[PDB]
Copies of this chain bind each other. A is one copy, B any other.
Amino acid sequence: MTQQIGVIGLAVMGKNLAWNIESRGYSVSVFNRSSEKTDLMVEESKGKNIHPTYSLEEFVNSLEKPRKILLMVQAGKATDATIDSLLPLLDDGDILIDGGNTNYQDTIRRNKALAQSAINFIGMGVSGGEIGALTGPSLMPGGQEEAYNKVADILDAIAAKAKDGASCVTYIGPNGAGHYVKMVHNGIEYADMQLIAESYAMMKELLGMSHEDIAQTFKDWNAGELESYLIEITGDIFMKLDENKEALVEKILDTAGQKGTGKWTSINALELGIPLTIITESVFARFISSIKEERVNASKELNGPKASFDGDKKDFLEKIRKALYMSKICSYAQGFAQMRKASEDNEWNLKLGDLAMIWREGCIIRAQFLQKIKDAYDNNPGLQNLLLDPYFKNIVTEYQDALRDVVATGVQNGVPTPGFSSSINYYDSYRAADLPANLIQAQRDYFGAHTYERKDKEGVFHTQWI
């Protein structure tokens, strides 16, 4: 008479999640304010246990208590509009689940407001794309821990499974913790794609490699430690030829699009005081990407060196490979330092090892790399920074020679390497016992009387320099 879970908003992401839930033996109610999308789902659901509803009242009354309602509607005001309409129809203990690409600060607000109406609110990050939602995504749910455990069985059944069987879902933390770490996953994803793009730019501009050799190189890289979904599809992309047997990717306009999640991570890092240089450079790299016609006009006015390489290209290709793997470690080390601080500031008590665990499959950044981050936190739960992990430390201690060679060669040949440059600069600053920040403190004391501390004496000092 009543279904076990309900899904509002039946675009392709909501349709696929509901179908995923139904494929595991659960009964699902579906509703869409525009009932035409409900009418096509039912025809695409011949045989499936999908119960359509054509009103919020009928939808809510269709669900067993405590009601489990998954919100898969457009982010922003539509989500708040759907919440406000449901609130009069719900009963105490009902559970709302926002699976959209929501800013975590809105989730904090909705969770706080709804809780005063005795209503549970789970903001859940969902990663994996359209195909990921239909077969097994990465799921980052945050909110009331008790309400999570009441829906954990459903989430665990639909989530992607790692090679050790563990489902790629776990309780992240209170209120907005889930949507927060989904935002950080996307920020990490930005840097992964930009580092691949810089490897690609070096192979094309500096080495003059054809699209076939570019694809084969990424495939060879994918058979080793760099194995990842993004590197896999990068190999497939350079295989996709077009009308006249040319690389289709070479005819795509170089203007990188964006939703909020990219700039949101960088803004949050700045607010928290975390040096998220690599991801931020990637976000900034998308900004420069978008002013195409301005760059086209600047290319005719500003000259640079002509890229040339007189050495062994296969040896240098391997240096790019080392540079890519080391830059991932530096980028992830920054992203996990941000989550550690956000956990502390928001009192989320995050378990960073669990985040790497649920990112091993389902999500876009999924890679064997994620298993070694989990190994890092499994070996040392108090690990203060990824660079200090014994395995990762041994890598960057080795690969730094190739990363320096790759950056310096890119700079002398006019090939921009913002992600590579940021990684090596992060490694050199983080390991530096003494930075030139003492001169910054001396200047601020000069013109602003901002005082300073000393390296030998303890206390606060001010100096009349002139």
Checking B251, B256, B436 against A198 with a beta-carbon cut-off of 8 angstroms, the contacting residue is B436
A interface residue count range (under 10 / 10 to 19 / 20 to 34 / 35 or more): 35 or more
Given contacts A288-B275, A431-B304, A435-B295, contact A251 B130 (CB under 8 A): no
Cα separation A200 to B434 with both chains bound (whole Å): 13
Checking B253, B425, B444 against A441 with a beta-carbon cut-off of 8 angstroms, the contacting residue is B253
A309 CB-CB contact with B under 8 Å:
no
A443 CB contacts on chain B under 8 angstroms: 193, 196, 230, 233-234, 237
Identify the closest chain B residue to A129 (Cβ). B447
Tell me if B284 and A275 are in contact (CB < 8 A). yes
Cα separation A193 to B448 with both chains bound (whole Å): 13
- The smallest C-beta distance from A466 to any residue of chain B, in angstroms, reads 5
Q: How many copies of the polypeptide does the oligomer hold?
A: 2
Tell me if B429 and A285 are in contact (CB < 8 A). yes
Tell me if B465 and A237 are in contact (CB < 8 A). yes
Cα separation A466 to B241 with both chains bound (whole Å): 11
Cα separation A64 to B443 with both chains bound (whole Å): 41
Identify the closest chain B residue to A445 (Cβ). B252
- The smallest C-beta distance from A331 to any residue of chain B, in angstroms, reads 13
A383 CB-CB contact with B under 8 Å:
no
A267 CB-CB contact with B under 8 Å:
yes
- The smallest C-beta distance from A421 to any residue of chain B, in angstroms, reads 4
Tell me if A234 and B418 are in contact (CB < 8 A). no
A385 CB contacts on chain B under 8 angstroms: 294, 298
Of A157-165, A219-227, A346-354, A400-408, the one with at least 4 CB within 8 A of chain B = A400-408
Cα separation A431 to B414 with both chains bound (whole Å): 10
Cα separation A47 to B273 with both chains bound (whole Å): 48
A438 CB contacts on chain B under 8 angstroms: 249-254
A43 CB-CB contact with B under 8 Å:
no
Identify the closest chain B residue to A407 (Cβ). B411
Checking B193, B270, B447 against A266 with a beta-carbon cut-off of 8 angstroms, the contacting residue is B270
A368 CB-CB contact with B under 8 Å:
no
A24 CB-CB contact with B under 8 Å:
no
Of A2-10, A34-42, A117-125, A449-457, the one with at least 4 CB within 8 A of chain B = A449-457
Cα separation A387 to B463 with both chains bound (whole Å): 39
Checking B129, B130, B250, B298 against A430 with a beta-carbon cut-off of 8 angstroms, the contacting residue is B298
A422 CB contacts on chain B under 8 angstroms: 281, 418, 421-422
A280 CB-CB contact with B under 8 Å:
yes
Identify the closest chain B residue to A401 (Cβ). B305
Given contacts A240-B463, A273-B290, A275-B288, contact A453 B263 (CB under 8 A): no
A433 CB-CB contact with B under 8 Å:
yes
A466 CB contacts on chain B under 8 angstroms: 233, 236, 240
A271 CB-CB contact with B under 8 Å:
yes
Tell me if A439 and B249 are in contact (CB < 8 A). yes
Q: What string of 1s and 0s marks CB contacts (under 8 Å) between A83-117 and chain B?
A: 00000000000000000000000000000000000
Checking B255, B431, B433 against A453 with a beta-carbon cut-off of 8 angstroms, the contacting residue is B255
Tell me if B289 and A437 are in contact (CB < 8 A). yes
A144 CB-CB contact with B under 8 Å:
no
* Residues from 203 to 238 in A contacting B, C-beta threshold 8 Å: 204, 229-230, 233-234, 236-237
Cα separation A382 to B267 with both chains bound (whole Å): 31
Q: What string of 1s and 0s marks CB contacts (under 8 Å) between A291-334 and chain B?
A: 00011111101111100000000000000000000000000000
Cα separation A127 to B407 with both chains bound (whole Å): 38
Q: What string of 1s and 0s marks CB contacts (under 8 Å) between A407-434 and chain B?
A: 1100110111110011011111111111
Identify the closest chain B residue to A298 (Cβ). B431
A132 CB contacts on chain B under 8 angstroms: 447
Tell me if A270 and B283 are in contact (CB < 8 A). yes
Q: List 20 A-B contacts (CB under 8 A).
A: A196-B439, A236-B466, A237-B439, A248-B463, A251-B438, A252-B453, A253-B441, A266-B266, A266-B270, A267-B267, A270-B283, A276-B284, A298-B385, A298-B430, A299-B432, A305-B404, A407-B421, A408-B412, A416-B432, A418-B429
With A266-B266, A298-B388 given, can you name 5 additional A-B contacts, CB distance below 8 Å?
Answer: A253-B441, A303-B397, A404-B412, A411-B425, A422-B422
